[PDB]
Ligand SMILES: *[C@@H]1O[C@H](CO)[C@@H](O)[C@H](O)[C@H]1NC(C)=O
Ligand SMILES: *[C@@H]1O[C@H](CO)[C@@H](O)[C@H](O)[C@H]1NC(C)=O
Ligand SMILES: *[C@@H]1O[C@H](CO)[C@@H](O)[C@H](O)[C@H]1NC(C)=O
């Protein structure tokens with residue numbers, strides 16, 4: 001079947017089936033220009049049994065790129081432009097078309113915290129302030145909400161959207177945690193006002209939670225309070241990410257990070273999505289326990305590793321990093337086929 005993704009209990013209902021899901025991150029899927037490369041990648045993700053793919057919903061620039069290069073929005077002090085041409089949001093339209101054909105669902109964030117593909121910094125270049133004043137910078141927020149409308153109105157009645165996501169890893173370093181609570185509240189109310197069919201979430205890493213062991217990710221240095229955020233009425237589920245190598249923690253600390261977040265989601269009466277994770281060293285050994293904790297903890301609705309890697313008919317490989325799990329590799333067998341088989 002094909003219906004809108006909803007929540008039943010503290011699980012997701014995807015095409016009429018209520019139960020845990022596995023998915024993957026494919027930020028780069030959104031920028032593929034050859035339709036055959038979106039088709040082969042989505043064929044592989046679907047035939048692997050994954051149900052949800054997270055793709056970027058942004059590609060922000062301050063200067064127009066070399067002719068032929070993809071860009072979705074040009075941010076300027078004197079008038080910004082949202083690109084709906086063939087080198088713009090039509091590349092994301094094909095990703096949604098292919099998700100519909102392959103019975104896949106998509107999580108789509110609207111801005112990056114980080115400067116990759118522009119991010120908050122491309123708004124600060126156009127509209128002044130800095131990365132923490134961005135949240136209440138009227139000109140930057142007015143353009144951000146114009147871009148949110150331009151993306152949400154294309155797919156608001158498509159059954160292939162799993163959830164809209166306010167941003168990738170929003171932080172407010174050193175800020176009061178109320179700055180992101182009030183921004184997330186207002187912006188998720190706005191997204192609900194444009195689309196009543198789809199779920200909405202924040203896209204944060206889950207930093208700031210007092211039920212942990214006091215490591216830096218549980219403290220409040222990055223402007224986020226997980227328990228305050230998941231209680232926002234217009235956010236339907238919580239997200240959290242996990243990178244012990246970057247965070248200075250050991251890999252086994254990841255299980256308690258999953259458990260504490262899951263319990264905070266369930267205390268708020270909602271599901272959690274373990275939305276990104278990776279280990280740079282020995283990923284099959286170090287990430288498989290995390291997948292089993294997530295599958296077996298009440299409050300979790302699904303998990304998505306960072307990240308899918310694939311290769312195309314002409315012999316080119318996709319973008320990648322040290323966390324890529326290449327389709328058909330031995331790490332794919334360990335972290336994708338074995339995990340889908342455990343779920344069902
Ligand atoms: C960002 O701007 C605000 C307001 O001027 C200021 O209070 C804060 O210190 C600035 N951040 C940095 C890192 O300078
Ligand atoms: C599209 O979805 C909106 C709810 O977000 C609904 O009001 C509208 O009727 C739907 N459009 C069609 C053509 O069904
Ligand atoms: C994937 O592996 C199978 C062998 O297990 C092979 O039949 C198929 O051609 C491979 N797919 C790609 C895209 O290489």
Ligand SMILES: *[C@H]1O[C@H](CO)[C@@H](O)[C@H](O)[C@H]1NC(C)=O
Pocket residue numbers: 213250252253
């Ligand atoms: C590191 O993690 C915890 C501290 O959070 C410690 O008790 C545990 O023994 C260590 N585990 C490994 C395998 O390093």
